[PDB]
From a paper:
The best conditions yielded crystals that belong to space group P41212 with a very long c-axis and diffract to 3.2 Å only, with the additional complication that diffraction is fairly anisotropic perpendicular to the long axis. Since each asymmetric unit in the two forms Natives 1 and 2 contained two monomers, it yielded 4-fold averaging, greatly improving the very poor phases coming from the weak molecular replacement solutions. This enabled automatic model building and manual rebuilding and refinement, using 2-fold non-crystallographic symmetry, to produce a high confidence structure, refined at 3.2 Å resolution with good R-factors and geometry. The structure of crenactin shows several loops that are longer than in actin, but overall, crenactin is closely related to eukaryotic actin, with an RMSD of 1.6 Å. Although crenactin is very closely related to eukaryotic actin in structure, crenactin’s sequence is longer than actin’s (432 for crenactin vs. 375 for yeast actin) and the extra residues are consumed to make a number of surface loops bigger. This is most pronounced in loops 295–322, which corresponds to a loop in actin that is involved in the formation of double helical filaments and has also been termed the ‘hydrophobic plug’. The crystals of crenactin have a very long c axis because they contain essentially infinite helical protofilaments. Eight subunits form a complete turn of 360° over a distance of 419 Å, the length of the unit cell of the crystals. This means that each subunit repeat is 52.4 Å and the angle from subunit to subunit is 45°. The helix is right-handed, as for actin filaments. The crenactin crystals contain a protofilament, made out of a single strand of crenactin subunits and this leads to an overall protofilament thickness of only 70 Å.
Crenactins, restricted to Crenarchaea, are more closely related to actin than bacterial MreB. Actins’ primary function seems to be regulated polymerisation into cytomotive filaments and for this they contain an ATPase that is sensitive to the polymerisation state. The exact biological function of crenactins is currently unknown, however they were found to be located in functional clusters with other genes, including SMC proteins (Structural Maintenance of Chromosomes), highlighting possible roles in DNA dynamics, for example. Here we show the crystal structure of crenactin from Pyrobaculum calidifontis at 3.2 Å resolution.
Numbering used by the authors:
A (entry chain A), B (entry chain B): 5 to 430
The structure:
């Protein structure tokens, strides 16, 4: 069937923090935290308050559903599982797999269908470029099981940045995509150029980790130790320099211009003091650069530090650059194609979503800008030739891609373990 | 008709790398690679990107049409096809003929005609001397078919080096003509003296493969593995010695005068180091004389080797000299005739296109010179009496050759099977 294919195509982007899902039909994707809450470490008179089915699996998942069992916990550090801390789930790590399985279930679960025609979903799934083969068969297995519980006609799985490309509708480009734990920057010429893939071991999270170590310095060590806390602080105070060293001065001589405060809870309000307005920039710049003495100051001894990690063959570089990285990405393609591929730089993901506060264009930069700056800094030659833009709706990009890709990808194509594309059926 | 014949005569040189094509009217022929892209192994939302018409044949050709589907598949070995790798298409090799047909169509396709009078092209085709009878019947069959899609009045097929004779307008001469895969050297006295035909089994391609192995030694193994890169390197750094050992010693003792760097893509730039500037000469000299311990060093163990191949009756000699081959050619004609056939040495093909870097005539040599030199080396006798020149525009010679030949070659002359000359009509 076909018209069918415009109602009943189902898209599911994973990655780190949220999991965007929903039918081809939504104007936007629903959005769900990428964590599970485990049920063992818990008082009993609230285990009865829990339906017997949900008690079955040691797992609860949901934006509101986990929201409201958070206060009565024993080990919130042991009982809260984040698989895909790094876009990748540790091969054998069982809880991590289980979370994903319920994450997979929950999402499908939100859209039951009354239509008598419905004869299954067409599920498309977006995983990190970083994602190894075992992880594909894993995700394949999950959806395989879940067709006992729901009508699933077919399932496939393209990479995340590929989806952005399909989503943008740009055949040739380099796609740099930052989410929570890392930025995968990946060149596309109709498919993922897998040797040109660079990953950075730093994402939306160092932006928190700098926020968190700033709040302690202002003197809010209370709020600091709560993640939900630092997120909205950072999301709301965070700034990106045009050049940082120039920005710092501009705010040290005119604090007033840059001071801010934001209400977290009707009771709570965080003000960034005249004393510290200038750290607002370390929040933003650290996605893009981490090479300034001022950012080096909080890695001195302070909390979760900046380093390289290794997943597949691939090494996510702790320090490098978005710039140095997009170049290194380019040097790793066919000499033939570097022209048409450096043509088009597309920024997607949460971690690039920064805005300039009205009246601050002076020295604050949005990410498209911060990046172009970085290129002219590095290669006036390239920069000139390059068109860098950011997607509208950075979170939902990888989604829209997944859904178009799921739409037309004809049903005759079977998944051939090694072609790395095509439908599976159960 | 006649003024007709100056508008609508169509020229088609084949051979190994490029196919020069175009109406008699163009100052230069169009140029198009002698390969095809086979469509089975591909991304499917990117064959939605192809005409279903061109999805018809498993084949695309086009200098740009192939260019932009090249990143869609890594290790292009099997998905890319060069028929006439050696100037001949392997007899039954089905895909090689398949390419040829679409190559044949493509070329014609580029010149649509609006004129009411047009009632057919007058097509002339250049093939290697080397080209067996089946291949003439085959190429004849091709154009026979496409006359259903295009207005084709008549067709005929002359040898490559004979076209150069006609193009040069030299009744009596030896034509040495070199492309990618081989140099054919063939004596002309109104006709091509078929017993005088010698082929060298090496062309502009060894100058690449010396480049390729030179590149690895400098330490650019990445770049070396792409054809498009090596070509551009070769073409840009390659040198022809006056005498090689005299040239090496000249660049070992003064590297600076011989170092060079060259921009491949706005990112990559390949420098030939102070250390190796002398290998630039191995690029040049290899077309002409693969007999030096230095060139023998890379045949030692290294990649695609220098050997004898065997086509029709003819053996393409791996190791021989353009000078020794020129002699041997001569020794196979009428003793009566050797005088004014050796009178005139004509140099054609891209493979001879070498230029000397301003201020290097000192020790570097263009191919006219390098050959002349090789003759006074071998027959001081011969040399003196001989005038050796290079065509201007060596790429496009064979082509003007074919158009003049197709121009005046009376239409009453039918293509007989054994006379090996005349028109077919379809
Ligand atoms: N304005 C903003 N500036 C910087 N980062 C942001 C902003 N808004 C949201 N984020 C980041 O969004 C991230 C989560 O987004 P998401 O697209 O789900 O990435 P992933 O799927 O890799 O977890 C968090 O790192 C948070 O830091
Ligand atoms: N400057 C140059 N020096 C030497 N060879 C060149 C140069 N430019 C192009 N070529 C050569 O042109 C050759 C192809 O010539 P072509 O006339 O198409 O022969 P064929 O048709 O037999 O392939 C390639 O070997 C390439 O090396």
């Amino acid at each position: 069937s076909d018209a069918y294919r415009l109602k009943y195509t189902f898209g599911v982007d994973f990655g780190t923090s949220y999991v965007k899902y929903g039918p081809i039909t939504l104007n936007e994707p629903k959005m769900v935290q990428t964590r599970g809450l485990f049920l063992r470490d818990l008082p009993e008179s609230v285990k009865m308050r829990i339906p017997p089915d949900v008690l079955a699996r040691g797992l609860v998942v949901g934006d509101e559903e986990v929201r409201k069992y958070l206060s009565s916990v024993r080990d919130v550090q042991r009982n809260l599982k984040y698989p895909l801390k790094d876009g990748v789930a540790r091969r054998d790590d069982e809880e991590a797999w289980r979370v994903l399985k319920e994450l997979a279930r929950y999402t499908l679960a939100q859209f039951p269908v009354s239509d008598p025609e419905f004869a299954g979903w067409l599920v498309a799934v977006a995983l990190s470029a970083l994602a190894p083969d075992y992880m594909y068969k894993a995700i394949f297995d999950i959806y395989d099981e879940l067709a006992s519980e729901f009508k699933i006609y077919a399932v496939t799985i393209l990479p995340q940045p590929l989806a952005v490309a399909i989503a943008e509708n740009a055949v040739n480009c380099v796609i740099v995509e930052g989410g929570h734990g890392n930025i995968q920057v990946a060149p596309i010429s109709f498919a993922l150029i897998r040797e040109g893939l660079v990953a950075l071991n730093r994402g939306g999270a160092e932006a928190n980790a700098i926020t968190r170590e700033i709040l302690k310095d202002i003197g809010y060590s209370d709020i600091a130790r709560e993640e939900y806390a630092v997120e909205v602080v950072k999301r709301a105070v965070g700034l990106v320099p045009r050049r940082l060293k120039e920005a710092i001065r501009a705010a040290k001589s005119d604090p007033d211009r840059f001071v801010t405060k934001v209400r977290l809870s009707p009771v709570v309000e965080v003000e960034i003091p005249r004393e510290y307005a200038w750290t607002r920039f370390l929040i933003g710049e650290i996605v893009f650069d981490p090479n300034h003495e001022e950012i080096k100051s909080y890695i001195e001894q302070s909390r979760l530090r900046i380093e390289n990690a290794v997943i597949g063959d691939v090494t996510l570089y702790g320090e490098m650059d978005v710039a140095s990285a997009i170049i290194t990405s380019l040097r790793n393609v066919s000499v033939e194609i570097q022209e048409r591929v450096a043509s088009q730089i597309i920024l997607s993901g949460g971690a690039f979503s920064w805005r300039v506060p009205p009246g601050m264009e002076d020295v604050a930069a949005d990410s498209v800008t911060r990046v172009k700056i970085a290129l002219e800094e590095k290669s006036p030659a390239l920069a000139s030739k390059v068109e860098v833009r950011l997607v509208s709706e950075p979170q939902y990009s990888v989604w829209r891609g997944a859904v178009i890709y799921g739409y037309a990808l004809p049903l005759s194509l079977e998944w051939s373990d090694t072609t790395r594309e095509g439908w599976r059926f159960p």
